[PDB]
A paper describes a structure:
Several lines of evidence support a role of CMS/[name] (Cas ligand with Multiple [name] domains/[name]) in the regulation of Cbl-directed RTK down regulation. CMS, also known as CD2AP (CD2 associated protein), shares overall domain organization with [name], containing three [name] (Src-Homology) domains, a proline-rich region and a coiled-coiled domain, and high sequence identity and hence, it has been assumed to belong to the same family of ubiquitously expressed adaptor molecules and elicit similar biological functions. Recently, [name] domains were identified as a new class of UBDs. In the current work, we have performed structural and mutational analysis of the three [name] domains of CD2AP and the third [name] domain of [name].
Residue numbers in the entry: -2 to -1, 270 to 328, 1 to 6
């Protein structure tokens, strides 16, 4: 039952704990409760980290059939 969000603004990680996200990226949301107010933890294409929560848009959980 994984949550997903779509990146609306890009963000380049500035330390080890951040996640670099590009516009259009579909990020797996891991945790909304992080040490920093306004930041979420996510996973993307093998990496993981925190990003600002208003750089992204929550998606409906609907997914087309896969192979």
């Amino acid at each position: 039952a994984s949550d997903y969000c779509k990146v609306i603004f890009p963000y380049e990680a500035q330390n080890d704990d951040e996640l670099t996200i590009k516009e259009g990226d579909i990020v797996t949301l891991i945790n909304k409760d992080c040490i920093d107010v306004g930041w979420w933890e996510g996973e993307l294409n093998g990496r993981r980290g925190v990003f600002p929560d208003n750089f992204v848009k929550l998606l409906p959980p609907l997914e087309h059939h896969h192979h």
